[PDB]
Amino acid sequence: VLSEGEWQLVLHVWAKVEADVAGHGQDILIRLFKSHPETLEKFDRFKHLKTEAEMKASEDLKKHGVTVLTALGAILKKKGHHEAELKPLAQSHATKHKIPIKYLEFISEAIIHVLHSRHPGDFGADAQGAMNKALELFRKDIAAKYKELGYQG
């Protein structure tokens, strides 16, 4: 479980992400798609996008970025009491979208890269540590629902 202090480090930097949800969402998805191109192939909506410049220009991608970060934010702010929010997400991602747990690890790494670029002063090693723990908790709870439903390990 995270401590109350580790949750404070997480939510202090998240309040900053919330000053520019759309800009953050874009940087994260682009980083994901460039670092792990197989992830782009899950999105019928985006797989036409070939270059970073085309990605940066897509308003539809920006929109999805806001969807992703807004769902994540609502989970983080529950501080691990996140059952009601996480269950519908794991169900759709397991059964409808077919998203391997490994890809959740990839987008975790993208989130932490981007936070580090935009918010150095609020994202030191102790914050990076807390954020890593929070994302692991997110993954571990998703993985439990995946196993229940019979989805890939």
Q: Which is nearer to ligand HEM, 9 or 99 (CB)?
A: 99
The answer to whether 71 contacts ligand HEM (rule: CB under 6 A) is yes
| Widest CA span in the chain | 43
Q: How far is the CB of 9 from ligand HEM (least distance, A)?
A: 19
Q: How far, rounded to the nearest angstrom, does the alpha carbon of residue 83 sit from its chain's CA centroid?
A: 17
**64 has binding-site annotation:** yes
Q: Are 91 and 99 in contact (CB under 8 A)?
A: no
1 to 40, contacts with ligand HEM by CB under 6 A? 39
End-to-end CA distance of the chain: 24
Q: Which one of 3, 67, 95, 117 is in contact with ligand HEM (CB under 6 A)?
A: 67
Query: d(Cα 16, Cα 116) in Å, to the nearest integer?
Result: 12
**Rounded-to-integer distance, Cα 69 and Cα 94, Å:** 19
Nearer to ligand HEM, 90 or 127 (CB): 90
Query: If binding is defined by CB under 6 A, does position 72 make contact with ligand HEM?
Result: yes
Q: How far apart are CA 58 and CA 61, in angstroms?
A: 5
Nearest distance, CB of residue 99 and ligand HEM, angstroms: 5
Q: Which residues of 58-84 are buried (b: 16+ CB within 10 A; e: fewer)?
A: beebbebbeebbeebeebbeebeebee
CB of 11 to ligand HEM, least distance (A): 16
Among 68, 76, 90, 115, binds ligand HEM (CB under 6 A): 68
Q: Return the residues of window 106-135 that contact ligand HEM according to CB under 6 A.
A: 107
**Residues forming the annotated binding site for O2?**
64
